Design a protein around this ligand. Structure first.
Ligand SMILES: Nc1ncccc1OCc1cccc2ccccc12
Length: 351
């Protein structure tokens, strides 16, 4: 049965949500979208409720709305955002116009724990173990996060971790310009558009994250794209002929060859005092040639995580059809597709 909704103005927009959800107040800072924290009286959980802004204004927006909902409906893993609820005040497709998504209230992200608290090597094991576990699941559904950084990683007081915010509304050229965390964790091949990328790009982001937990400092805080490439190549060495061949972007390949050849540095001298096993993993994550990176599944078996590795408890995802991605539909067609996904939503099992 359809619940009763109540209406309230919450920062310039009218939120219409089911009565179960009480005590809504704006959260983040406008940084996650229109997000409210709330109390869910049916489950006793503190939740974040996102109302999607103008979800069907264009074909791009309609498809994006469909994308996000699809993705969040699929994800059922301890180390990944799960969809608690999705709803609309609309009793029909004709009145359908707003989508609302509900997940667990985050509270703290990984910047908060790196900036404000001090991390033992065993915290870094556990934190990275969990990112890689959720990544194994995601990548097994041929999903690519593309935007892993500390700020879309939720951590609770027990240092338990979720991957959130698949970053779905891709970034503006301007958001990616200058001295910004939005670019510091990106694999070189996407930052500079060297080749058709793939899921190996997230492993690079993991390396950057792991180095910063170990050191307390950003691995490659470039003042811009080029300055950041320089930081990267200084640590990792300039590419060889093998990696150059793979760079499809003739222009990008011609630029790299302008640079003076540099050898890969000794990570034991970069990460002084670090656990040798941490250093060894880092060397295998932070590989310029992405074909040669350690995968999430290979990385879970790495000796650094022996404390936590259980191969009978590192699950894969059900198959994820994203054939819709290469599909050209009109606004109303995406919109109806979305509406059906709202209507078919089944809540997660109760404990
Ligand atoms: N979980 C959160 N807790 C506190 C603040 C932001 C959060 O995530 C914000 C967020 C990002 C992406 C999808 C979402 C879907 C529903 C609710 C929130 C969503």
């Amino acid at each position: 049965e359809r619940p009763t909704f109540y209406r309230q103005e919450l920062n310039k927009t009218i939120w219409e949500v089911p009565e179960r959800y009480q005590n809504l107040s704006p959260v983040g800072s406008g940084a996650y979208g229109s997000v409210c924290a709330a109390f869910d009286t049916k489950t006793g959980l503190r939740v974040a409720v996102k109302k999607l802004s103008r979800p069907f204004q264009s074909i791009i927006h309609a498809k994006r709305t469909y994308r996000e909902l699809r993705l969040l409906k699929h994800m059922k893993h301890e180390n990944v955002i799960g969809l608690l609820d999705v709803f609309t005040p609309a009793r029909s497709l004709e009145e359908f116009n707003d989508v609302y998504l509900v997940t667990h209230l985050m509270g703290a992200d990984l910047n908060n724990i790196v900036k404000c608290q001090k991390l033992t090597d065993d915290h870094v094991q556990f934190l990275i173990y969990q990112i890689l576990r959720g990544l194994k699941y995601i990548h097994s559904a041929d999903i690519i996060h593309r935007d892993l950084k500390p700020s879309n990683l939720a951590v609770n007081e027990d240092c338990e971790l979720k991957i959130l915010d698949f970053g779905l509304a891709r970034h503006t050229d301007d958001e990616m310009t200058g001295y910004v965390a939005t670019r510091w964790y990106r694999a070189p091949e996407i930052m500079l558009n060297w080749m058709h990328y793939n899921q190996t790009v997230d492993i690079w982001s993991v390396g950057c994250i792991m180095a910063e937990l170990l050191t307390g400092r950003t691995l490659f805080p470039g003042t811009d794209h080029i300055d950041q490439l320089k930081l990267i190549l200084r640590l990792v060495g300039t590419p060889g002929a093998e990696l150059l061949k793979k760079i499809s972007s003739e222009s990008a390949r011609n630029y790299i060859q302008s640079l003076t050849q540099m050898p890969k540095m000794n990570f034991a001298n970069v990460f002084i005092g670090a656990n040798p096993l941490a250093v060894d993993l880092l060397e295998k994550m932070l590989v310029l040639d992405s074909d040669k990176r350690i995968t999430a599944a290979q990385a879970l078996a790495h000796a650094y995580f022996a404390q936590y590795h259980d191969p009978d408890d590192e699950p894969v995802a059900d198959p994820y059809d994203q054939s819709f991605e290469s599909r050209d539909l009109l606004i109303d067609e995406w919109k109806s597709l979305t509406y059906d996904e709202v209507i078919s939503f089944v809540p997660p099992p109760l404990d």
